[PDB]
Structures are given as structure tokens and as C-alpha cells.
Amino acid sequence: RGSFVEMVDNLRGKSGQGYYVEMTVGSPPQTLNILVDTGSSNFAVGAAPHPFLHRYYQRQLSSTYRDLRKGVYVPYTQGKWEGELGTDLVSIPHGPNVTVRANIAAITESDKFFINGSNWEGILGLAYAEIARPDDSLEPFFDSLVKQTHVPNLFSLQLCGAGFPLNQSEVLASVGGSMIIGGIDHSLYTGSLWYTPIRREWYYEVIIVRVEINGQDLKMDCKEYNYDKSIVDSGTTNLRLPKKVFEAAVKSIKAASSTEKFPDGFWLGEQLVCWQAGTTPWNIFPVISLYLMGEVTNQSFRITILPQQYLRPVEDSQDDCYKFAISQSSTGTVMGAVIMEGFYVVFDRARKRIGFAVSACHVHDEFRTAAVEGPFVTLDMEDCGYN
């Protein structure tokens, strides 16, 4: 049974532009769409005009606004923003029926942060205080929510990829998934939930113990898979892999899909590939299994993703087109939005663990489905973690 009906279907968006939830800030409430980001820890909103924003937070209109008299600078891999710290009353209309006083970074300047047509005006960093900017004394939103209310210290995400392109009007009208705050809604998944420990509380860090491409072991020292860390990040589109793992994975994926030759630009994640309407050769592309450390000593489980997850639908014509949504990383493994689209992901902060189950909305075909299976006997899994 599904017990959180008020929060089911509260997300919109897509992997390439991010998934967002509606929130309100201030008194009277100012409605804004907010990017759900498990890869950062600041709550920040556009607070000044920007060409890609059609609304922004107006602090002078909020009776409950409190100025913290301090600036904040947040650089990300490519995008960045700077703003002014303050606090205000915050609510989530399709969330728990509570109002909390939270820190808000009012974005005054930004560069390649806001995305044209994404429909979001701010970001909700759901990770831990350790990585909050300027420092860990800036309480993240979720920490404030749990401290001020009876909301349990857990949230879960079901990101729903459509499996095809959504134009501007379609993406605004479509249900992009669910963020269940304080619980697990059992209607959002099939099979069982398997848990992996959160290695450390900064990013949502996990440990990958084995990798397979169509059942074939990538056969790398497991430390390579987590070099320098492995994280679950809804604020990044792609599955990102450490340089050496990416080189081994692409070589194996190419070998598995060898009946069709794709250009270098495709494997670099830059160029789209197209097939006549309905003819995408899903069967030629391999499944990818990531084995994760289990909660029981010497036990692991695996999550299996299809090309329907790692090939991101893009519009070109009546052709079905995609980009390869696996990228090289110099900052460790990133289980991005395309991977999370295959699963219902439980961020169980209370029990320092992350759960995975097959998503009720994952894209698949009549021959193969995503999977979450276990247990497997795995030795010396602690050695897989990088120091």
C-alpha cells in the first residue's frame, strides 16, 4: 500500500534539466520551483532578475525575512552563484504540512547555474552540513525541518524519466516523480528494498564492490570504482565514472554493442544517435550492474540498469534519438539522475543507509527490466573504500 498520497507525484522535470518540487518562502508565501539536489547542502533561490527566471524571491515583500548580514559564494563544477544569507519561513505545498524557519541564500549573481526552460528558480541541497557553504555552521534545510518538527529523519525519491522527449508544454504538464518527506511510500517500487551503508555523512557516499557489463566482470580493483568517492547525486544528469573505470566500461559497452558502430562523439556524451521511429535496438546494448556493500558483514547486493536508463532521450523528425548518459569523472563515481530514474531511492539518514528498489516508473521493454537483487557473498568490502 501507498501511505503518502499528498506527496506522491509532487515532482516535475527531466534528467537533462533537473527534477524540482514546489516550495513557498516568506510571509505572505512566495511560490518557487526548487531543484531537488542530493549532491549539495545549501537552500538557495534566485532573488534578483535573471533572463532565465520569470520569478524570484523578493525579500523586501516578506514580513518574516531576517537578514544574516553575510555573503556566500558557491562554485560548482561548471556553474556558480553568489548571494546573501538570511532566514525565512519555508513550506512545501505537496509535502509535510509544516512550516519551518530555514537558512536561505538569496542569489544576487550567477554564471551558468540557471537553465533556460528548466522551470526552477532555486536549489534544495539535501546532503549534510559538512559540505554546506560557507561552512558547516549553516544548517541545511532538511536538518532544520527535522529539528523543528516531528518529520522523521528520512526522505525518498522516485525520479521518473519519460523514456522519450518531452517538449516545453509537455514537461510542464507531466508528472516527473515523487519526493516523500519523512517516509517510504510502498506504491513507488516493485520487489524488495535493499540497503547500502552511508559510508560518511557529507555527500550521500556509498561503496561499489563490483561492476558487470551484461554479467561480465569489469575485473578492476574495487578501490578504482570509488576513487576518490562514490555518491548518489540527483543534481547531476549522468552516471559519472572515474577515468580508468570509464575507459574500461566504454570499451566493454562498445564490445557488447559491436553489431552497430557509433561515432566517437556519441561515446563522449556530446552527439546524439537516431533510429527510425520505434526501432531503437535496445537489445544490442548491455545491462550494467553495480554491486553495493550490504548492511550485513560480507554481504553485497546489486542494482541493474538498462540502456533505457543510460541512453537519455533527446529530440533531433520522427526519429527516436538519444545521448550516451555515461561520462568520465576526475571526482569519483556519481550515480546521477539517469541512474536514479531506474530506482526508488530511500535516503534513510536516521539509520545512516540508502535503500534501492526497482522503480514502479522505470523505462523498460518486454524482454528486460531493471533489478535490485541479493544477497551475494563479498569479502574485504572495506578495502573498496578510498582514503
Ligand SMILES: CCCN(CCC)C(=O)c1cc(C)cc(C(=O)N[C@@H](Cc2cc(F)cc(F)c2)[C@H](O)[C@H]2CN(C(=O)c3ccccc3)CCN2)c1
Ligand atoms: C542537472 C541538470 C544538468 N546538469 C547541469 C547543467 C549542464 C548536469 O548534469 C551537471 C553536470 C556536471 C558536470 C556537474 C553538475 C553539478 O555541479 N551539479 C550540482 C548541482 C547543480 C545543478 C544544476 F542544474 C546547475 C548547477 F550549476 C549545479 C551538484 O550539487 C554537484 C556539485 N558538486 C560540485 O560541483 C563539486 C564540488 C567539489 C568537488 C567536485 C564536484 C558536488 C557534487 N554535486 C551538474
